[PDB]
Amino acid sequence: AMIVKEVYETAEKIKSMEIRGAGRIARAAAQALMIQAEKSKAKEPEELWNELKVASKILYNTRPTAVSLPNALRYVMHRVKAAYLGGADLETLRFTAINSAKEFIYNSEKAIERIGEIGAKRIEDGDIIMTHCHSKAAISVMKKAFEQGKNIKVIVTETRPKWQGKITAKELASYGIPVIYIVDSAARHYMKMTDKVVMGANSITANGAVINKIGTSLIALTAKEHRVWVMIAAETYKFHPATMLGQLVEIEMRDPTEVIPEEELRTWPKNIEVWNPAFDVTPPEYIDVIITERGIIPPYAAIDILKEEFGWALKYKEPWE
Amino acid sequence: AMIVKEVYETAEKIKSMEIRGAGRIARAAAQALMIQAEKSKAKEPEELWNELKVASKILYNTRPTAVSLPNALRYVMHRVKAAYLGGADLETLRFTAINSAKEFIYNSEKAIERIGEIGAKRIEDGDIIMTHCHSKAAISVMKKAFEQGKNIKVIVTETRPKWQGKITAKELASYGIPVIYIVDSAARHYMKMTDKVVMGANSITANGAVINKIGTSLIALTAKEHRVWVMIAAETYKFHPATMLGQLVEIEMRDPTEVIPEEELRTWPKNIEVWNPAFDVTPPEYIDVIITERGIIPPYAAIDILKEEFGWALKYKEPWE
Amino acid sequence: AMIVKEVYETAEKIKSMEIRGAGRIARAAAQALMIQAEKSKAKEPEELWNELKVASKILYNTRPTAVSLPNALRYVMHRVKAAYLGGADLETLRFTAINSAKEFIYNSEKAIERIGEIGAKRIEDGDIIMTHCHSKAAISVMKKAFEQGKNIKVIVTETRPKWQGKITAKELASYGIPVIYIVDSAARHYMKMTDKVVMGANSITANGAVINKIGTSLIALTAKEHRVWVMIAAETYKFHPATMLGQLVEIEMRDPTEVIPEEELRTWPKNIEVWNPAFDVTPPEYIDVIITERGIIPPYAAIDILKEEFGWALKYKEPWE
Amino acid sequence: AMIVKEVYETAEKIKSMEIRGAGRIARAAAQALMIQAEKSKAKEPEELWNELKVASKILYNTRPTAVSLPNALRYVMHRVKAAYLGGADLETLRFTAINSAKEFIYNSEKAIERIGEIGAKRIEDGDIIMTHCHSKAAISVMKKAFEQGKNIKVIVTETRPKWQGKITAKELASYGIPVIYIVDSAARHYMKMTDKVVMGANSITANGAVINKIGTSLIALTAKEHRVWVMIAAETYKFHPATMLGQLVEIEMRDPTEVIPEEELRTWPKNIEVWNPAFDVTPPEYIDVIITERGIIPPYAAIDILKEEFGWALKYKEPWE
Amino acid sequence: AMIVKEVYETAEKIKSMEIRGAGRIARAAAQALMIQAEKSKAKEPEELWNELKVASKILYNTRPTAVSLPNALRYVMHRVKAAYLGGADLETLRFTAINSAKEFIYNSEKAIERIGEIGAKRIEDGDIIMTHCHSKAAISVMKKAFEQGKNIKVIVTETRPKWQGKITAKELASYGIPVIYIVDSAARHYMKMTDKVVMGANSITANGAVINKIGTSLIALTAKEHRVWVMIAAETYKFHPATMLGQLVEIEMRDPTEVIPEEELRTWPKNIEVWNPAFDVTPPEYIDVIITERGIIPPYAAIDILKEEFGWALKYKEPWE
Amino acid sequence: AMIVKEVYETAEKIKSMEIRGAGRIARAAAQALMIQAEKSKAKEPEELWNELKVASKILYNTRPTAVSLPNALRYVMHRVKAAYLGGADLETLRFTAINSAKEFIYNSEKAIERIGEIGAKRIEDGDIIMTHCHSKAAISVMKKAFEQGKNIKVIVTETRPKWQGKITAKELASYGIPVIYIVDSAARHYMKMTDKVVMGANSITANGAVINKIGTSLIALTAKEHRVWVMIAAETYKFHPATMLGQLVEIEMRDPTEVIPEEELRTWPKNIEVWNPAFDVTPPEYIDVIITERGIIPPYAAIDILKEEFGWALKYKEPWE
Ligand SMILES: O=P(O)(O)OC[C@H]1O[C@H](OP(=O)(O)O)[C@H](O)[C@@H]1O
Ligand SMILES: O=P(O)(O)OC[C@H]1O[C@H](OP(=O)(O)O)[C@H](O)[C@@H]1O
Ligand SMILES: O=P(O)(O)OC[C@H]1O[C@H](OP(=O)(O)O)[C@H](O)[C@@H]1O
Ligand SMILES: O=P(O)(O)OC[C@H]1O[C@H](OP(=O)(O)O)[C@H](O)[C@@H]1O
Ligand SMILES: O=P(O)(O)OC[C@H]1O[C@H](OP(=O)(O)O)[C@H](O)[C@@H]1O
Ligand SMILES: O=P(O)(O)OC[C@H]1O[C@H](OP(=O)(O)O)[C@H](O)[C@@H]1O
């Protein structure tokens, strides 16, 4: 394990959330295996197979909740394993890693674009769209709907604690899309004026439940109370294979100082705990479609996305062990 | 109109929200009429009746949404008007103002205490209580339940944009009550662990709808989804007489810089608007009781609170015009 | 029983529905007792008390469902009975009938006006209002909201079988109020664009259930699904005293030829029955306020309207027996 | 483009709705391509491929909402295209069109029959069935349930504006099936006495939403409120492929004179608009099964009907362009 | 405290549930004070006031949940206290106790009869009525509806653990009323065939919640799911004054051997606990009316029953302390 | 048809419910065909094919509702038919029956184990689990969750009329799992303290509806009201193929003396009927996942379980006719 520096820097960027968003974290991790296999000072295949195994674990142990990341690594390492176990020279394996990781990064970019093309068709001229957090897939939809000539207006929820709504406001604002910026608490008060909800996903489960930024479940709840469509924009690599076998997705708890700043937090009584769930889970009865690069589906056909693509891997162990 | 300084300082403190909370704003305004009538350099009754009329308008025009304030002024000025129009000397009227405003301030303090006594009886040993904002009435309930020996734990929602949840956390924390501090978005994720919701009110309407800090409606929604009791703690002067005759309560929109700080806000594109509703409206089907100083009621008996106390005043004009 | 002609002509106009609408039917019936007592060729009091008793029964037996009618007659005949049983000359009783029936007709006109004043305050500039049938009380609200300067637009449901929506469209259209005319089936499809529902009542019960034109219950249902306010505009004489003692309101079934025309109906197979309920019942959980001349109430305070006004009469028999 | 007369006459019959019902419109259009290819005075293949392309567009541009029609044309023209582009003589192509259009017409008739066989098994002896409009598939179910010996009774909703319920009443009435005929507004009032709802479809979407005659959504709503099964009877060619890629189905607005007759309509104020949506959309949470010729499915497996049959065509363009 | 034997025998009969039903327990307790004051060997008033105080506590401490019992004692002892504290001879006080307890027993019998008269008017010819437990008030309604000529059929739920449904089946069966007897679990399966639910109450609260035999809440839930009316039949002395001041009603837990017999229970592992709540609480949103001797009310007007009758006593202490 | 004794004894044990539980009944029936083919005194193949056909019908006609049983027989007799109709000697066919029935019994045992492995992953440390009846699959989940180290506590509903909850309490109690034993009526009162519901199935339909012990539907209802997960544990052979073609599952009505004992029942009036449905049907909107040996699915993917495994058999007749 003579792991390159960039693998470590990616991992610490993922953890700190300097690199964030579940699509991007997955491309960043595939990027990090790519730069491993390129800069490897390795002589044998069996030495390279060890390096990528180890870089895979490092990058897996960063953040648990977005399955995009585990699937990026699997899409690389399923292939690299089958090459090694069939028997391949140094520059063949090195290639298979760089070329698997090339495919995935490209595939992600295609999927996000193709999601906007498909999602925008469900946005109508004049629509007010409420969103949450900063999702590239979700934003792909709104952009495309604006480019088509529809006069949308987007309500951006600020998305505490990490303020991702500021990112989202600035990004849409600067494509010409008008934005209304509200605190998260104001989501029911403005649900009446909203015509559609577009939000993203970190993981999607067997039964169609959507794991996504904290607060997603509440917006979906009140959307459902007012009969406003909740549409989840999500690449197929966001769907969670392990949930097919009864696994619950771990909900990451991030540092309390994101909520109350360190300087302030340390002055507070011992008998206040600050809890910081980064995600919540939204049931499928509150979601209208999931928009993927293969199409619109009801949330309940999550299980079919998972069967046809990821199901074969579950009788096997993980491909970096 | 030779209005005293303290009336102006109260009014600007109310507007800036250095004085906040609907019970307190009402006692602050009654306090401000009291210090007018004491420091008046007035010779005639008809000169005093003008001063208090004018101080009444100043204090009314501060903030629209909490009806506690209009009712504090009415409780003073209904009486002061009936004295003047019956015919009373300078020091008789001066007294009637100081002594009406004495009664109200005391009445408020009694009511809040008596609300805790009544509300705490609905809190059970071991309960987790979710609250919102900073409400003295609500806090009166939690305190009393702690003093009775029940081992509660309170989830405090941070209550953006003005961070009132920090006030609430520190205040309960320092009575020995453990606190769990979450962002507002995390309210559904923690509704499962919550046993009761206790929140306050700015206005309560004819039909039982509750106007309260932005986000109240969402917590009540999900509480109702999980069958957790929403209990609203509120003095009878929080109920809104004008709504008996079809008036909708005005929902105050406060400065966008409370949301995004000035320094930051001015750098943002012109095509982002920041909206800041200070309140939302929660329907009566999502509220289990309202706890007042006269008792528990279903939300629908709001109309009876209003009939027996404030209804007589509605065929008349306002008592400072 | 030498009953005047106008009593018979009113009764047949009420039955055929040439005179319709529950407020109007009640004023028409009070008008019919008035013209009895004026044109009476009667010598004794005891002869007059018989005539009005008999004209009361005739007018009661026209149509069962709108309680406005029974209450108009009661408001006349409670008084006329107490005069006779105390002992009064011919022209005293004659007067008491004409002057009770004067009061009621005036009271109705005041109430309807005062309902519009109170209801319009719940209509906001820009609102789209969905209505049903032709209700003078409901229309009073929309008119007043237009006169105040609000730019409303009203969706009129055609209101089969008797096409009352044509009346409603023409009446609002000709006050300058724009109208969108839809079939009754189109009510959910357009509930999303609707901001408020304003409808009237034939009877309101103890528990707050609203009896009104067939189709009211469905509009209220879907309004509730979309969280659009259902507001029922209704005079206090629309509330049903007998329901306080467990009586269900009879739902009138009118001639099948209103549905399918005679010429056509007679050609159809024997094994098709055409049913024609004139009314349906809408539960109080789907109604937001009832607007009356005394004020806004939650539907559940129906029982209080009934207690304070009509309850005393229920230990007694009917005042024309 | 020397298009035969019958293509034009079919198209104008489809538009006027002299030919109506989504199964029938699709067989009428396949019938119209059949009579084109038979009566063609064409010398070349490339001349015939032009004629059918042009007759296909004519018949497609009639009415947008029922996808049965586009799928009838596709089932013909997918095949005729593959013959031409492989290379086939005049009488080979002519045949492929006549023989594709033979298959479809037969397939439709089989499917409708087979739907009744499958649907009737969900109807129980004594059931009251509420229906809407005139659907051959729906009627196939009720007929078969009657033939099996079950003593049903059908509530026919009149189905304004075009009165399709008259068709439905007469058709069932004349198979011995008793019918109760109500206005559309009366659907909740009679939902309590109803045991099952059987209705048809114009289009069914990816996510399981059902597009069908205006008023379907309301009946389904109240059915769901009372827990009465809504069963949608629909051939697989009713399902909408384009919705797999995010397309919303266009909802046809038909002439306002269907609602208010011309003679009458022209006398009305300019400021009344008459809107006439021919269809509405019913969400899948309000539908219990969809009965197709391949079987019962939950509405959410719409996406699987679409994947296995129509999905291959969506990477391609339309087969008449 | 030379307490008579019959007071002790009543108390042990109440505890064992040989005397059961909340109306009856209250008449049994009033009967027990009556036989105290008649058989008293007391010389002074102050000796008699002690005896009845002590017999009152004995009878209060039997079973907590039915408030009928506390109100029977209060109706006796409010009066007996006011006599003593005004100053009355032995045979005056003795009388006031016997004559207060005479009134109450009679009042109960009138109320139950009058409840059937009022409730039966809401039962329609042909109705299937589901009931629970054995309630005299509820049974009063069904009897009266049968006597009026309506052809009802009653579904009796067996009402574990104490099998009260056997009592109910036999009692209705023997008035000619047909009965269908089901286990409690079968209540949803038969809710579709049910037209009305009639059940009784032990306590009714300020906010309209109904405490009644274990299982009431579930029947009410599914009734509400199917839109079947839940009607609660209950005397005004069933309503709970203390809940006006925030008191929760204690839910009695009875011996586990009622569930699993002693002989059997003692053989079971130590790590099985048998819990036996005698009651549950049903929210007011699931109840359609409460039928009392003063009339039908929505459940939310519980607070008004309590205000006008029992509210005066709550600033005072209990009248046997 | 020289049927062996054990086939008859199994059948009468199945009917009496000495052998019960839908997994077990299916293994008992496969066991009974196995012992037929082993003890057959048959000379020809065509004689053996008759014996197993006849033993198949006997075992099918025992109890209708659990489809596990029909599928056990089909899994045996699909194979035995294809052997015979291809042409096989006595000891070849005899084997094919014994070896098909070997596979199924083993497959069942694997499936139940594998269900616990998959289900337990959805149970979390500290969970309170409510169950119903006695289901081996459900119990497999709870056991495995206990073995993993999670500190669960199970609420066992007694499950009248046949007291299966006693079986369940004793079985879990004796693996160290603490149990709380309640009557069935107490299920809502304890739903608040419950974290998960785990229950089994007799049949699962095309649309995802679950047929299971009487009372399942009610627990699922209130679970859904409180947002507690309902998870159904069920082998793939529990899913019902015939429902794919519109068949409703027959709901078995068992002897009324299970409810009220014979000795007692015969003394009761003629006009009491005792109804005893053994099962009820729970809609898929109230079920969160179904846990099978192939995985977690949303209830709506029932149709996919059925398509891939049992669908091929439905164009054919039954394989013992
Ligand atoms: O992958 P895209 O669509 O861009 O974003 C998907 C989701 O990832 C983000 O989480 P975080 O910022 O990693 O905490 C948000 O939850 C967002 O909805
Ligand atoms: O009167 P008390 O019970 O203390 O507080 C009542 C309510 O007043 C506050 O509003 P703001 O802080 O004036 O904006 C919050 O909405 C709080 O719930
Ligand atoms: O009394 P107003 O408010 O005018 O009308 C009240 C109601 O009376 C009408 O019934 P009908 O036309 O008598 O059958 C409609 O139901 C309308 O909503
Ligand atoms: O295809 P079938 O089952 O016969 O009818 C299906 C549907 O087509 C009809 O529409 P229209 O009459 O074309 O406007 C109705 O909406 C009906 O439910
Ligand atoms: O007073 P009545 O209407 O007769 O019965 C009222 C209620 O009292 C009974 O309780 P228990 O048998 O004392 O445990 C049942 O809960 C019944 O519904
Ligand atoms: O197959 P397993 O999971 O063991 O049990 C499944 C179901 O079978 C039982 O029915 P019965 O006892 O045959 O009446 C219960 O309904 C139980 O939930």
Author numbering:
A (entry chain A), B (entry chain A), C (entry chain A), D (entry chain A), E (entry chain A), F (entry chain A): 3 to 323
Paper text:
In summary, our study demonstrates that PH0208 protein would function as a purine nucleotide dependent R15Pi enzyme and not as a homologue of the regulatory subunit of eIF2B. In NMP degradation pathway, R15Pi catalyzes the conversion of ribose-1,5-bisphosphate (R15P, substrate) into ribulose-1,5-bisphosphate (RuBP, product) in an adenosine 5′-monophosphate (AMP)-dependent manner. AMP acts as an activator of R15Pi and in its absence the enzymatic activity has been found to decline dramatically. Monomer of PH0208 protein consists of an N-terminal α-helical domain (residues 1–122) and a C-terminal α-β-α sandwich domain (residues 123–324).
To identify the binding site of ribonucleotides, either co-crystallization or soaking of PH0208-WT, PH0208-C135S and PH0208-D204N proteins with AMP, GMP, CMP and TMP was performed. Mutation of the two catalytic residues (Cys135 and Asp204) did not alter the binding behavior of AMP to the protein. In case of both the mutants, PH0208-C135S and PH0208-D204N, AMP occupies a similar position to that of PH0208-WT protein with the major interactions arising from the three subunits of the hexamer. Both, AMP and GMP bind to PH0208 protein even after the mutation of the catalytic residues (PH0208-C135S and PH0208-D204N) at the active site pocket.
